[PDB]
Amino acid sequence: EQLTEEQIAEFKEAFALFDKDGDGTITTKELGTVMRSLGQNPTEAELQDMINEVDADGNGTIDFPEFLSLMARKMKEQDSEEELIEAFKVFDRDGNGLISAAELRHVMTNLGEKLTDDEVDEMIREADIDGDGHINYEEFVRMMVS
């Protein structure tokens, strides 16, 4: 058990948008063509780093198996990111990109923990890097995963 025929089809369709000449490989050049379509014009050096990070057999191009592997890991990654984003948005009651002491205390109460200002301030101090007395998304993630 790993993937359905439909999943593999969608993986192939995506690979094809990179493999411009259908040779079964994505090169630095082909990756460049796609990115240039998306508004980025990376250097050959930048493209080669992008390939080297995922070309497992060090053969210089990415094959469909190599793509499946990097895709599956990116998707799981994005699942985790999304959970963190949705949580940050539960806490950032006003959406200004920062969890304040008042916001955190409000959400904690509803989460079942009726906290004092001193307690919530200590929580924030633990996570606060830029010293602004608020928890911004990076600070939230860094604490939640470490």
Residues that bind Ca ion (CB under 5 A): 19, 21, 23, 25, 42, 55, 57, 59, 92, 94, 96, 98, 128, 130, 132, 134
Which residue, 43 or 116, has its beta carbon nearer to Ca ion?
Answer: 43
Burial class (CB in 10 A: 0-12, 13-18, 19+), 78: exposed
Which residue, 7 or 96, has its beta carbon nearer to Ca ion?
Answer: 96
Residue 141, CA atoms < 13 Å, CB-side half-sphere:
9
Annotated binding site: 19, 21, 23, 25, 30, 55, 57, 59, 61, 66, 92, 94, 96, 103, 128, 130, 132, 134, 139
Least separation in angstroms between CB 85 and Ca ion: 15
> How far is residue 21's CA from residue 35's CA, in Å, rounded to a whole number?
16
Which tokens belong to 17?
A: 């948008």
Residue 111's CB: how many other CB atoms inside 10 A? Answer: 11
Which residue, 8 or 56, has its beta carbon nearer to Ca ion?
Answer: 56
Of 96, 75, 91, 93, nearest in space to 123 by CA:
91
Annotated binding site for Ca(2+): 19, 21, 23, 25, 30, 55, 57, 59, 61, 66, 92, 94, 96, 103, 128, 130, 132, 134, 139
